[PDB]
């Protein structure tokens, strides 16, 4: 993949 | 949150 | 949060 | 948070 | 992968 | 946090 | 991978 | 934190 | 990998 | 790897 961006955020 | 589950996957 | 589980995976 | 588990993996 | 960026954050 | 576990792995 | 950047943060 | 475990590994 | 950068932080 | 940078910090 070119760019993989992730935010996996628990509040 | 009780459970936060994530898969952010680039193939 | 109780459980936060993440996989951020670039292949 | 109770449990925070992460895998941030570039292949 | 070109760029893999991740934030796996439990609050 | 109770448990924070991370693997940040570049292959 | 070109760049692998991760923050796995338990608060 | 109770347990903080990390592997930050470049291959 | 070119750059592997990680912060695995328990607060 | 070119650069591997890690901070594994328990507070």
CB H10 within 8 A of CB I1: yes
**CA pair distance D5, I7, nearest whole angstrom:** 13
Closest CA to E6 of A9, H1, J6, J1: A9
All residues of chain D having their beta carbon less than 8 Å from the beta carbon of residue A4 are 10
DSSP class of E7 = E
Closest CA to C8 of E11, J4, G1: G1
Structure tokens at F7: 């693997």
1-11 of I, contacting F, C-beta below 8 A: 1-6, 8-11
**CA pair distance H4, D3, nearest whole angstrom:** 10
Distance between D6 CA and the closest CA of chain G, angstroms: 6
* Residues 6+ positions from G1 with CB-CB distance below 8 Å: C10, D10, D11, E1, E2, E3, E4, F10, F11, I1, I2, I4
**CA pair distance D5, E10, nearest whole angstrom:** 9
Structure tokens at H8: 């930050």
Experimental method: electron diffraction
- Tokens 């903080």 — which residue? H4
**CA pair distance J11, J8, nearest whole angstrom:** 10
Phi, psi of C2 (to 5 degrees): -70, -60
β-pair partners for B5: C5
Structure tokens at G8: 């796995």
């Amino acid at each position: 993949v070119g760019s993989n961006k992730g935010a996996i955020i628990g509040l």
